[PDB]
Amino acid sequence: NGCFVDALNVVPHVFLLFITFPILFIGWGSTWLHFPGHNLRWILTFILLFVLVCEIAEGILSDHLHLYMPAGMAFMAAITSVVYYHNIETSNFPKLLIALLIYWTLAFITKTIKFVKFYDHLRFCLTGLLVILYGMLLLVEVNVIRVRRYIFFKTPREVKPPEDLQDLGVRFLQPFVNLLSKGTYWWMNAFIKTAHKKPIDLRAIGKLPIAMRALTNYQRLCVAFDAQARKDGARAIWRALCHAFGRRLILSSTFRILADLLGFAGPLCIFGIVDHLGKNAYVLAVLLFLALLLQRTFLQASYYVAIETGINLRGAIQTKIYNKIMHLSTSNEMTAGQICNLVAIDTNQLMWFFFLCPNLWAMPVQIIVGVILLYYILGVSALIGAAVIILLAPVQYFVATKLSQAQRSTLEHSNERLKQTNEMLRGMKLLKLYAWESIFCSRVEVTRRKEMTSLRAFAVYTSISIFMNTAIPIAAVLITFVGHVSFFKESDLSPSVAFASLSLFHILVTPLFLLSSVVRSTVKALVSVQKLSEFLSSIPWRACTKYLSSAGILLLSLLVFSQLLKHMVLVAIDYWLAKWTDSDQSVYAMVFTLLCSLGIVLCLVTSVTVEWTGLKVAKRLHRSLLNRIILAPMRFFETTPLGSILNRFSSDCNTIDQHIPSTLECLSRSTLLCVSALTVISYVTPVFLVALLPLAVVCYFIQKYFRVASRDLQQLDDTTQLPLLSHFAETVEGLTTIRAFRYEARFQQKLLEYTDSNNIASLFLTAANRWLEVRMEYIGACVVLIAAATSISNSLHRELSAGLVGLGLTYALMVSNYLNWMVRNLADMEIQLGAVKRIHALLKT
Amino acid sequence: HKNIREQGRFLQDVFTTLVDLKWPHTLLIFTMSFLCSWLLFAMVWWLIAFAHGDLAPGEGTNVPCVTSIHSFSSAFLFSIEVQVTIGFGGRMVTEECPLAILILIVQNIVGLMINAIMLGCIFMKTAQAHRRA
Amino acid sequence: HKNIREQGRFLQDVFTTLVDLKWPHTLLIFTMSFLCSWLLFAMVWWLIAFAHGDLAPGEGTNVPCVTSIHSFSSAFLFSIEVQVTIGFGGRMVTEECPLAILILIVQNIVGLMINAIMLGCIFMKTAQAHRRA
């Protein structure tokens, strides 16, 4: 009686879905109470979601409606259980919980009957997993009734909802939300929507929870330092920090490694789909969708947990070294500058190293899984390719080091220039009273040429970096595919093999760059902690239009058309590989080699173009600014403060030279790669095009609401950084007066206040970045889901063309990362262009 | 109001909560009450006719607990026929199965109770005279 | 009173307006509510039986969605049979057409809602104690 047991299973889901609707409709028509097992409940509910997807897959394979209805009903039943638990977290009851418990017991009974009747005779594993999950959720409910007094005698002795994160006005509620929103940052919707209208400020911002303050982190760190020093240094302080920050860091690291595993897993199911159609695929498509969303969610949660641990550590060691500043002796100018660098660069190094700590653990497993996976797909030839990409990682590091050296030299020259300016902008009336100004401007221009000379080598190294970035992906495929078929064994290379190798090449290129910066950050952090131990123990298109018109018509088109042609080559190589796959193999491989050479030559040309153009623009802009400032009237110089006039030259110039060319290059590459990927996934499946324009319009709404806040928070950060450092300096000089007045307590209070005001800003900023990241990624996974779902049917059932699905899947598996690069670089370019606009504001004097 | 220590009394006022609502929401939740109950008992009846084996189309050696029942659709028609007390009588519940007698004797009383509350509360609503305010 | 800037609240008090009325007017508007609804659904049922083609008298190759329906008159008899919950059962709605199931499942709920209001408001009326004034 199989259908009989199927119906018997359908019944309890129906019972629960029917009782949920009155209460849900009353509730749909500010104290958060959490219960033990909440996080376990949500984890188990997501596992139920997964197993139910698998059951739906089984029902599709078998088909008989009544035979696969139980899965479709348990789906809504679990979603309604989630709705119930949200309605109970928002307002507590003893009865709604019993309402859940009844359903759990009945579903367990039905599943047991299914299991018995099966034992008497794929289904087996799924039914067993569901049984185990329902049983564990039952035990969770029993724990919940055991905790409070719903079935017990009258009173609960109920907790009294937590005042830490729910009492007096606060806004950053990360630890006090639903474990789904703890992942998807849903609580930021309200903040960002309100931020769109009203400008954010410290009165509109929250206050940090008791879970993360100066006092809390200082307390944990001093407890660890005490427990380590009572057993008596650099290693000591290190182990103290380690044992003090404990579980959060390793939790982030394991989130990260699981995400890395699933990311290495994606391309293999791509490969399986490509195999199946050329010779069980819808299941692989939905599994790919699920795995993408879960992997990226875990990656983002990992990032956030690491960032928060780092912010805790910064606050802690900052207030600690300020506590040490009170007890130091007067015999120990140079020490003050060393102290304020110990807070401005050493502490930032420590905290950014703590950002990158889990990446250092997750990188080796990533490259190992990558190489072993690509070996089993391409054989011995794979190994050869696996060398080339890896060889880029040490070289990169070398390049980076050269940059640093260059930077140092340049900085020196820059400093001297500033000196030769500070005189002219002070003896203004003296200077213009006899018109010796041109004589000094000649000297100022003499310094500028030396500065320009340094910048050439720096930008050459930047060009080499950008060149290798996109050259190694091309070279890997070149020397691998040419060295696999036409060299070793003449093995027929199915489209699946080549496209899986392509996907893995990108998924391995992305982490490789980060290892170099990680090594540099780690050694620098080691040096900075040795230092700390030695111390402690003693904008419109008009701004960009003018910026690019200062370059001239000579280089504008030379840049733009070269970029367009490089991206066209980068897509055409894969387009021709698509026809290469199905099987004149030798002629095919030769054409592939020609395309590979064109790509690298064009990339080098584009990089050199960007370098030369940026340098020329900086030159002309500086000269024009100097000339326009020279011919100003005296009353203008007397009216405007010196800080603004000097500051533009001091930073604006420096900022532009250091960051505008690289960021502009990155923005251009990102936007063109995204447009190319969209065009590829459109040409592969025509109908998919018409489905992708809706989602993209969604991104437009996600753009505005982001920038109008991301800019705002940004500037707030800057402000909370300025009085903090200055405060430090004030304590160092007048140290004797402050230790004499015995005013140490009030000043320590002020510094805790300032570090809290800094942390709230630097925390909301990372929360907003996580928000934009996760939502853009969810859409980037929706697009690949829809693309694969259209490709499996349209390109197989009717079109019956296999070279198509490869390109579409390979580009849709990665379009999301290009999208994120695009949006972030766009925000940075906008803030930098807004910085540039004030130079033109000064130009019209 | 901010920071209300909700101890659940907001829903504990079960009908004095929803008699406050607008008309579309209250009409929605009333139709959802009625459809919920009807579908629940239609499912249980479908199942009981399936289980007795009267659902298996056969001539002789049996009499269905509910005469002339064929599929889920006719079963839901029987549920709405007995629940809301129209009583069409094309499908007859018979004196062969006392289990069907039990399901009827609970169906009707729950139907009558939920009808009684869903009339009292709508009347308690039509004494909304705030409009006179 | 003269020159009342009517913003419509005079009718916005929909039932607290008519519970003020006399008895003949209120009885008139109640019978008009009931007859209006009955005629509406009788028309839609006539049309659906016409459209399915079950209205075309034919023996075999079909079963009418509503057994034994011939003309508009018998259709209006079916409408008043299912609406006001007498349920005569001479004409049977069948499990062949789900569209008839939908029309029944909305007919009955609207019938029940308009019955509920037309009882609550008449009771809210019988608390007219101005006669005691």
Ligand SMILES: COc1ccc(Cl)cc1C(=O)NCCc1ccc(S(=O)(=O)NC(=O)NC2CCCCC2)cc1
């Ligand atoms: C570039 O990505 C990655 C890709 C892959 C891997 Cl395996 C690691 C990373 C990575 O970055 N490593 C984690 C550490 C990290 C650092 C910065 C960022 S972040 O996103 O650029 N910045 C923020 O979130 N907030 C900032 C933080 C500084 C104060 C101001 C707000 C995100 C994360």
